[PDB]
Amino acid sequence: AELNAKTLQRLPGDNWRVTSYSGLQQTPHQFPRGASPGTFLHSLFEDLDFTQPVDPNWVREKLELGGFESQWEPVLTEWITAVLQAPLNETGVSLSQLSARNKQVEMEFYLPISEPLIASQLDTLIRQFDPLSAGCPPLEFMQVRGMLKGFIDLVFRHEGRYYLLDYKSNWLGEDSSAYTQQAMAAAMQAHRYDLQYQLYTLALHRYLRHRIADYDYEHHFGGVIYLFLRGVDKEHPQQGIYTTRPNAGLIALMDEMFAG
Amino acid sequence: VVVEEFDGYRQIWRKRGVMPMLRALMSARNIAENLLATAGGERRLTDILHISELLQEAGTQLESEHALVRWLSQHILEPDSNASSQQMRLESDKHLVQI
Amino acid sequence: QLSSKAADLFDQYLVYRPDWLAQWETGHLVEGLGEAQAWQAPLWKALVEYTHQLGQPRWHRANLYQRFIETLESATTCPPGLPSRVFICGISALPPVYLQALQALGKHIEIHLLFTNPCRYYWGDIKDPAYLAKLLTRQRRHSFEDRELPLFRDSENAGQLFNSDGEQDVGNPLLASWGKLGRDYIYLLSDLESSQELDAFVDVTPDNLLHNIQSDILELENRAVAGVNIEEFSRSDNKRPLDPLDSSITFHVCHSPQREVEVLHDRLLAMLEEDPTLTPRDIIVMVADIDSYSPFIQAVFGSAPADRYLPYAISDRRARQSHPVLEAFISLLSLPDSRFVSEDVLALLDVPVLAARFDITEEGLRYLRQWVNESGIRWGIDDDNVRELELPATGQHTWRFGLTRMLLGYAMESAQGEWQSVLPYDESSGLIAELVGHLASLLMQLNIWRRGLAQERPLEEWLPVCRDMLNAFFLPDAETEAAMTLIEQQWQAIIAEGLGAQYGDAVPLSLLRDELAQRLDQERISQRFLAGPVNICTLMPMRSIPFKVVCLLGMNDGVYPRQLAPLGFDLMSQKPKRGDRSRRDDDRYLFLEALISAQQKLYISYIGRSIQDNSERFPSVLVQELIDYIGQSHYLPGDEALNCDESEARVKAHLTCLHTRMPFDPQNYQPGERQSYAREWLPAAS
Amino acid sequence: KLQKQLLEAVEHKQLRPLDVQFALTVAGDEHPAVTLAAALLSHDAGEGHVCLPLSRLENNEASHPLLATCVSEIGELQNWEECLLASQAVSRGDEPTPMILCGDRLYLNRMWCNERTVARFFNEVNHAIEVDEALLAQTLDKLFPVSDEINWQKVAAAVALTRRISVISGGPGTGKTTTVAKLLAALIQMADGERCRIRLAAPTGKAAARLTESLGKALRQLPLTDEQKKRIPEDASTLHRLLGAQPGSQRLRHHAGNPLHLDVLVVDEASMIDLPMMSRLIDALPDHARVIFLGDRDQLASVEAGAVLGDICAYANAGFTAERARQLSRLTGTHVPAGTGTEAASLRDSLCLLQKSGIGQLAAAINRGDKTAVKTVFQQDFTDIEKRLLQSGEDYIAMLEEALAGYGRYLDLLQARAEPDLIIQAFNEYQLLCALREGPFGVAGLNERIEQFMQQKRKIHRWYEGRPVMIARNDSALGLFNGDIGIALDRGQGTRVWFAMPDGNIKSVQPSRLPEHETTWAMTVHKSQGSEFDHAALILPSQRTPVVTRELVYTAVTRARRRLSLYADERILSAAIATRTERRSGLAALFSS
């Protein structure tokens, strides 16, 4: 007898996915390098109390739980104090000055994108108002429509002005001044951290707009802070920290781009 | 050219597994249709699909592809005799004399 | 094993039975309780006394909440540190202790309970004939009109509330049988004195067979025709008319799990084609055990052609990152008890990391496979290992005999003769014999660790062992550093719980090895659940997400529900209470949650006939009770008057479809309602 | 004991794990002197050294400072012979023992059977083949026109014919292949009715195809009938293929049971014949077969550890025996010089050295003092030889500048986008040779500095387009062997490395399919043996190290077809000429017995 098999006409499915910024891009130096040492450096500041100084018995038990020996702790409890006492941006905010009331650690946000996000349709707006987007070619990612994920290391408010903080370590081969204003921004363009804080600000802007009654971007926003752990030194306040404020005209068009 | 298509089969073998690669091999070579045309070949095809199910079963447990080939060769030397490893009944045997 | 099973009951005794442990703390015994309760009261009494000797805090979940309710009973309205408002969403089962603490918490913080119930009326039980006076309170609606039980005061006496127990008829029989969980729960919610309950119910206009059942469960009515009298037994028109074109509720009989999911892939394509807007994210497939169907889910969805391919995401699957790294390390902890068979040591070389530490290349392992075979390496590693098993010492067929046989052949040709009474192995005299030196460095490390792991050590002496064994036997890479860190994280957390509990007795390695096997496999990953591919995962209690298309697999009798037997000495199973949770009632209530959650189509599939011996199987009693309620409450338009039972089985046979045994069966490709979308077997069927 | 002490040597990388485990098993629990003596024996045997003399192990001047841990163990007993022979791990050869101590040289039974088989085959089992001297002289007179003076090529043909086993020694470009054609032509013409089966063999397929073409051009220069041209050998194959060496196992299809079916066998470039292959070839030879070896005494492969030909031609400097000098005088029709004294009769009579060839004058001055060496590289310049004094790093960069000039024609053909076949022939026009492996001057040193000089200059940007690659280890599957070169380019089907088969057909190989590859812009002087290069440059370090030797610089100069260049210090180069490679093999000691 005769027989046939049905064939689907319309496309089997479109792109709807939930992805983070990882799905888009796709002596302190002697510290070990890898995913395990990086997660330990982050685990330190996770439960760390900023106001109280560092206890050597606490550092010994943290490295003991992580498997490290006692060779570290004498070099750690010192370097940790240098990170918490380092001033930030213009206001000179020290990490130890933050009370637990203003502390928010490990924020997980879901940022929906409505229309499909096209690479070329994005980087043109990015490179327009952002000087850091001039270097490197345009970002390359497939059309994505769905929810966006991300993890904010620290969010705090000081003098009625919110800030954004993130932790990076990496840098296996460098110790000295090779962390600088030109070199740190050079690696920000290399690892494509540009879009990362631009998407983090759009997130934080929408959260502050949603949570705070009568919110304004220019008034309450203090900018972005990228803290490089191994780059923090007692000699140079500029080494290890990176601060940049969005143009406030980029987020206005960015929020409209993702809304429709 | 045969090395090229067998390389493409190795890619699907690595990205998916045993069952999807054997599915693509049977679809490209058209052996599934040729076996049903051969007399007594449907009994041959029932064993190929059943092995492809057991290799997908043991393929999920062992991620190493060479350990998968060693698992198959080990079971070929000594039969496991397990009920799940027993030969399934051929289709249409309901109309055939039952011994 | 006893210490773990008892710690699980004391944890359940904390939550659900705080008064028991309160009596056992003083030493008194509860009157009218099951046997074995004798020896359990001191074991808890000593536990509170032993943890008091260690200096750890005395406060615990049992005795704490009573003072917590009392301190919030009389106090100021503004205690510090508490949040403004709290939400409870998706949780359909809570113990009475938590609801008592939340009731006293309502005097300060505003708590909103989000609770999904199938019936808009009150289907719960009743305490006493005087308790219904407190249940006569109105339920506020968005229409501001008060809502009360149906029939008003007539349904209270009625036949509904009967004897000293709860509701009898309970309206729809589907809600009474399956809803045994939500029964006690809605009974505990209505018991709160200060709670303000308000309802918002969207009426489901019956059209499809699915909306017909959701209606009957919502309005709490019995649409099944029992045929009490011959006048009712004859005319079948009094049932609800069923359209033959309704795909909402369908039942499918398959042969094996392979052919079952392969048919599901064809029916999901027919549902995506038949509707203009259908998102695979909105489609869910629930399986009894996801681990058994996981290879078949991945096979049929990974072998689909490009145009036929659809994205899929498996969830609740046990998280496994690197399989060999975890399995070999567990086999490394068995070294003191291992016989060191030649195939086992070569299985340790199967891992590329263990070979990279000793720099044995993959091309060189093929030489070791033939050398170990030809050089006579079979039995254990050393001669001392042979005597340790109380087997007579030989001196041959050992890793030391083989290595010496291989190393002697490198220096001296086999034609010379015997030396120690070990014949030289001539196969490698050259630069290829360097691999024998790398293999000999492996067995040296295997000989050192097997002697060190035999002696029992205190918990503090087992901490460095994991870190010293990993770096010695393995050379980490970018991929395996994540799995090896999860080993040290789980290994050190187990000892940290032992050192935190002050256990100073020596422990054997066999205890920590089996403890690693249990804790490592329990890790799962939910990350891919809602990611937007079609959702595949096992049925999880308390998790109900409304979906358009809901599928069910593995409904065979005895597979579902999931049978977990009590420990048998547990006292809670002897005298059950309201808020007691059992896995049987969880899965039975899950089948009801999946029935109400589907907003468009419902897919239920099970194996009717086993594909191996061609025997008869049976669906779960839940599916059997459903198909019985469908046929009795509905009739086909062909015969409006036939008979009650004859129209019943006619509807049940119409919704049940029996798929063929093999994919190349020509019946699948016949033009009609069910037609396979697979083009690969089209030339095979022709 | 010394066990844990030996475990540090693995971390110190002074010993391989094969040497340590072989030392623990064989020596066992005996004195630590026996344990480390088998440890350094397995180490030297791993590097290719045949034996381990006891005088080198005793002196503190030896390497591997782990040796300094012996003074705390051996306790300065001063007797290595009494301590080692007492243990069961060392014997005099009577018992089946792994290690054998005979002439003060300790070494494995494998090396002992190979040394005994090789030294005996040259001393014994060989028979003097007696043929008519008048007829043999008339044949050689028709091959060689000039009878007025003594011809070394005429003696080489007379010695090879009159003796079953013989070796013809001479430098590159001295007419060795032409002398072989005269030997093979006179061999077929000698026996008209008797069966003549000739086989051509080489350790490498490269020099094998070099033997077939060169023997073909020389044989067509002589007249022969159709029966003689029928007995002319067809082609040469690798010595491993001739013996039928299986890729997977070590077994041979011939060995003692099945002899090679042959009349005469000619092995070209015998310098690359290590002691294992010479001993494996001897047992495969029947009693009626004559074998002829080709090579030079000063080639580095002859003096390398494990080599045979190096110690064989070492006795050729003494000359022929007094009697053979009279017998060869009646054959060649000239006056053949007689060597002074009697050392080894059978060995000296089976050897011949061809002294007739800027490359030739320099190489001849290498064996002499440095006064003739410095004078030859200096005056008149020969147009084939240049010298650049290299001390400071500024002359080290100019070294890389002229290194580009040699690759100038090659680098352009890469950037001109030519075909792979012509570029394969083009990479043979220039090569770099360096003594050391590592350091500022060496294989590891140059490859980094050279590729860095390729980044500074824009010639080629970086598998990079146009890169030459050499194969580090032999591969039986792909048909390519160690010492062979390839060119990687995109033909439009993909990026693939191409090789030239002996049949002339090109063979494409994917970059991931090569078993081993390395940057060939500089080569190790030992790995370039047998290959030909139109232009060559030698790189020697400013440091003074024994690694630089005479036979290394010799094989660097002989590696150039015509053009050659040198960058070295007059102090370092000339002093290295005086230093020669030391061989520990006990073969030359058995010939004196």
GROMACS .gro file of C-alpha atoms in nm, chain A residues 1-19 32-37 39 61-69 101 110 145-147 149 211, chain C residues 269 272-273 275-276 278-281 306-311 463 467 481 485 488 492-493 496 527 530-533 666 669-673 675-679 682 685-686:
model
   84
    1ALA     CA    1   0.000   0.000   0.000
    2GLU     CA    2   0.092   0.366  -0.031
    3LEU     CA    3   0.238   0.555   0.265
    4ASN     CA    4   0.394   0.891   0.347
    5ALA     CA    5   0.545   1.075   0.642
    6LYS     CA    6   0.435   1.423   0.748
    7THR     CA    7   0.691   1.704   0.723
    8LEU     CA    8   0.693   2.010   0.948
    9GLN     CA    9   0.650   2.337   0.758
   10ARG     CA   10   0.721   2.611   1.013
   11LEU     CA   11   1.052   2.626   1.197
   12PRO     CA   12   1.072   2.366   1.477
   13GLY     CA   13   1.167   2.630   1.733
   14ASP     CA   14   1.311   2.975   1.785
   15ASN     CA   15   1.579   3.092   2.028
   16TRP     CA   16   1.454   3.142   2.383
   17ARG     CA   17   1.727   3.088   2.642
   18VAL     CA   18   1.846   3.210   2.982
   19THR     CA   19   2.217   3.294   2.965
   32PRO     CA   20   4.841   2.983   4.270
   33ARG     CA   21   4.640   3.031   3.952
   34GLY     CA   22   4.333   2.847   3.833
   35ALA     CA   23   3.963   2.808   3.903
   36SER     CA   24   4.016   2.663   4.251
   37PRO     CA   25   4.244   2.947   4.376
   39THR     CA   26   3.706   3.063   4.396
   61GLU     CA   27   4.108   2.783   5.943
   62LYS     CA   28   3.995   2.908   5.601
   63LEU     CA   29   4.311   2.780   5.430
   64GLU     CA   30   4.279   2.462   5.636
   65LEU     CA   31   3.925   2.405   5.507
   66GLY     CA   32   4.040   2.479   5.151
   67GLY     CA   33   4.333   2.238   5.175
   68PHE     CA   34   4.614   2.494   5.177
   69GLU     CA   35   4.899   2.479   5.427
  101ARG     CA   36   2.314   4.762   5.695
  110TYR     CA   37   1.729   3.824   3.607
  145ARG     CA   38   1.592   3.637   2.330
  146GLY     CA   39   1.515   3.550   2.691
  147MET     CA   40   1.631   3.618   3.046
  149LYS     CA   41   2.167   3.613   3.441
  211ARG     CA   42   1.282   4.944   4.463
  628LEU     CA   43   0.590   1.781   1.681
  631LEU     CA   44   0.392   2.234   1.778
  632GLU     CA   45   0.252   2.223   1.423
  634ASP     CA   46  -0.098   2.560   1.704
  635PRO     CA   47   0.032   2.900   1.588
  637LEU     CA   48   0.355   2.698   2.114
  638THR     CA   49   0.685   2.738   2.298
  639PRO     CA   50   0.891   2.427   2.387
  640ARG     CA   51   0.957   2.609   2.714
  665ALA     CA   52   1.819   1.957   1.161
  666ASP     CA   53   1.471   2.058   1.043
  667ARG     CA   54   1.324   1.801   1.284
  668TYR     CA   55   1.553   1.893   1.575
  669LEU     CA   56   1.408   2.067   1.880
  670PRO     CA   57   1.598   2.186   2.189
  822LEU     CA   58   4.244   1.542   5.652
  826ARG     CA   59   4.521   1.621   4.930
  840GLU     CA   60   4.059   2.079   3.854
  844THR     CA   61   3.813   2.040   4.405
  847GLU     CA   62   3.841   1.780   4.853
  851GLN     CA   63   3.695   1.773   5.413
  852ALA     CA   64   3.333   1.867   5.491
  855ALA     CA   65   3.472   1.874   5.955
  886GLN     CA   66   2.019   2.507   3.617
  889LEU     CA   67   1.343   2.676   3.272
  890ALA     CA   68   1.619   2.759   3.021
  891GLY     CA   69   1.360   2.737   2.741
  892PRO     CA   70   1.424   2.400   2.580
 1025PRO     CA   71   0.415   0.071   0.820
 1028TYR     CA   72   0.312   0.608   0.823
 1029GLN     CA   73  -0.048   0.545   0.718
 1030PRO     CA   74  -0.230   0.876   0.653
 1031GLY     CA   75  -0.455   0.962   0.944
 1032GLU     CA   76  -0.452   1.116   1.289
 1034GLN     CA   77   0.144   0.976   1.174
 1035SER     CA   78   0.516   0.963   1.245
 1036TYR     CA   79   0.727   1.262   1.143
 1037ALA     CA   80   1.037   1.043   1.097
 1038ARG     CA   81   1.151   1.042   0.734
 1041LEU     CA   82   0.998   0.608   0.527
 1044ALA     CA   83   0.848   0.106   0.548
 1045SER     CA   84   0.790   0.133   0.172
   0.00000   0.00000   0.00000
